[PDB]
Amino acid sequence: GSIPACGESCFKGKCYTPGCSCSKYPLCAKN
Known part of the structure; x- marks a missing residue:
């Protein structure tokens, strides 16, 4: 769910x- 965390x-x-x-x-969000 975190956008800045993944940055993908x-x-x-x-x-x-x-x-x-x-x-x-x-963009892919990390959790």
């Missing part, structure tokens, strides 16, 4: 950072 971006592919979810398009 989801697009034409699954989240790169393990544990992060694309629950905040277009």
Whole structure:
């Protein structure tokens, strides 16, 4: 759920950072 924690971006592919979810398009949030 934490955006700044993961700092990953989801697009034409699954989240790169393990544990992060694309629950905040277009970026993956860590928990």
